[PDB]
Design a protein around this ligand. Structure first.
Ligand code: 31Z
Ligand code: 31Z
Lengths: 196, 198
């Protein structure tokens, strides 16, 4: 079994990459695509709070993302891994570190301590980082304001810091290239890991 | 201002004590009494998830108690402390430490790290611990309102003892084995000595 997470800001081609890689992996592996809360009842209710929430305190929001993460991990991810599945998970711990920790200003290590409580040692076996420049990412967003532009840059800066410190499970894919190549590089990286 | 929390297992008479003590304190201090979620909408919606939980994972439950704690602290406690009020809170971080950490088995230090993210340095100035023996506690439950319930009750008490041993300075342990009139009086007097020394 394998627990593979996908990380990157918006405009990184993440949705296209997961769907295309899923279609290629299904030939050889029992594979699933998922994202938090991913249909888990408690997680869905938490997501309703987050999405109905107005001016929510950033720490409360971080704790809700971590609570939906745990529900999705315990009721979806772990049973799938137990079945021998390759789990392709859209966003996990690193999204909270880059968005809540870095971009929102809580502190990466403070958001890490929170998410280590939530995942309780269950780190991904492999994490694909779709390394897009802010400029290409910004262009893909308009295809698919000032505060939004700067928040997007801060998210990327956050991801740079996370990938700088930890580089074992992390595999950076050049997401500035056309999506066909981003898909191919992501596919080859996954196969190399799975076949090892 | 002062942030005073109230802790204890069920059967310690905690609700009864806090109500009576608050009623006496209102006569001399600008004081509010609250508990989580305490009407804060997001906290109330979180409370509904906790209660609707079917064999909920203990870590998710702990994070929901901590998110409810943040909302209640941010919207009710901190603004009252900024207005110079005395804030009496029925259950706070130590309830998570004792129930989720010790009795549920997540570990006190792990639940403490979660709750330190939630409270962001805002520990109580004083914590009243209603120190009821497991035997008096057991009997009081049967009068106010099995083997598994008794064991969890003993574990909650053992947990609070562990927390108090490691952080004695913040706590004031009140004999909760004595009649409720006496528990109220000792709790009220402990709070007065603290309030008149600030
Ligand atoms: C997983 C995750 C995502 N995000 C971001 C990722 C980029 C998009 N934003 C906004 C957004 C967009 C859509 C939804 C949406 O799902 O409609 C959404 O709600 C949730 C997404 C995941 C979990 C939860 Cl509890 C809510 C959301 F916050 C969330 C974080 O800030 N932190 C995390 O840990
Ligand atoms: C504050 C707190 C309380 N408890 C216990 C205290 C003893 C009673 N139980 C059960 C209980 C009883 C009533 C309610 C109730 O409020 O009806 C309740 O729901 C909540 C109480 C506080 C916060 C939240 Cl999110 C839910 C509850 F869990 C919870 C914990 O285990 N951890 C904590 O952090």
């Amino acid at each position: 079994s394998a627990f593979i997470t996908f990380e990157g800001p918006e405009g990184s081609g993440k949705t296209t990459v997961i769907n295309e890689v899923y279609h290629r992996l299904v030939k050889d592996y029992d594979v699933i695509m998922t994202r938090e809360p991913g249909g888990v009842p408690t997680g869905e209710e938490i997501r309703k709070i987050v999405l109905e929430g107005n001016d929510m305190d950033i720490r409360t929001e971080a704790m809700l993302f971590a609570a939906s993460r745990r529900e999705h991990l315990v009721l979806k991810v772990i049973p799938a891994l137990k079945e021998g599945k390759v789990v392709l998970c859209d966003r996990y711990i690193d999204s909270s570190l880059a968005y809540q920790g870095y971009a929102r200003g809580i502190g990466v290590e403070e958001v890490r301590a929170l998410n280590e409580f939530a995942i309780n040692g269950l780190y991904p076996d492999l994490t694909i980082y779709l390394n897009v420049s802010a400029e290409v990412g910004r262009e893909r967003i308009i295809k698919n304001d000032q505060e939004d532009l700067k928040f997007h840059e801060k998210v990327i800066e956050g991801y740079q810091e996370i990938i700088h410190n930890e580089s074992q499970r992390f595999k950076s894919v050049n997401a500035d290239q056309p999506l066909e190549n981003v898909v191919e590089d992501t596919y080859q990286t996954i196969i190399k890991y799975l076949e090892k």
